C-alpha cells in the first residue's frame, strides 16, 4: 500500500490541476468571443 497511495494522491493532485487548466482555456475562449 505504499504504491496505491501514490496513485490517488497523484490522481487527485493532477485532477485538481487539470480542472484549473480547463478552466483557463475556458476563460481564454472566453476572452476570444
Amino acid at each position: 500500500e505504499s504504491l496505491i497511495n501514490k496513485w490517488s494522491l497523484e490522481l487527485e493532485d493532477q485532477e485538481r490541476h487539470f480542472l484549473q487548466q480547463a478552466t483557463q482555456v475556458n476563460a481564454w475562449d472566453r476572452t476570444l468571443i
Binding site: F18, D29, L32
Partner: protein, 205 residues
Amino acid sequence: TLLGDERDAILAKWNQLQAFWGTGKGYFNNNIDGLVVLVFNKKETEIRSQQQQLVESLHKVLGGNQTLTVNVEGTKTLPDDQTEVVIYVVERSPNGTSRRVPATTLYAHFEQANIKTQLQQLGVTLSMTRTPAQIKQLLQNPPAGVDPIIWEQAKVDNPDSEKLIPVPMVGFKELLRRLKVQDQMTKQHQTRLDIISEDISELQK
C-alpha cells in the same frame, strides 16, 4: 479483495473511454463547422504540389464568385498514392458577414452527379461529412458517449446559449485540442484585425 477494485477505479479514472473518467470531465461551450473530407487518388503528395489550384479548382466547382471561399483544415497521408484533404467553405453575405457553409448542404452540393463527375476529374474518389432549429437538432438527442443527466445540466448551466452550445470535451489531449484551435483561431483574429487596420491606414492616408 477491496484492493483490486480501487486499482480498477483508478485505471478507469485515467481513460478516454468515460467510466467516471478520472474525473477528467469538463465541458466547454462551443458557439453555434462545415467540414468535408475528401479522398484523393493522388499521392499526399499530388496535393501539397498544387494546393492553389486544387481549392480553386474546388472554388469554381462551387461557381467561382467572390460571397464563397474554400479553406483547407489538414492534409494526411493515408497510403503510398493516397491522401485525405479536409475542407470547409465560408460564404459572405451582402453585408459583409461571413459564416461557414454547413457540412450537409455542402455535401449535398458535391454529391451531385456533374459536380461529382467534376470532382472525380480532380482525382476525388470519395467524400464524407462529419455530421435556428438545427441547434435544437443536435444539442439534444446526447453526443460521444456523454451521459445524458450531465449533458442536460451543461445545457441549463450554459452561460450564453446563441452564442453557444454545449460541446463535449474529452481529458488532456482534448484541452490540447482546444488550445490548438485557440491558436488557430488566434492567428486569424490577429489577421482580420490587421485587415481593418490596413483599411483604416488607407482611409487616413
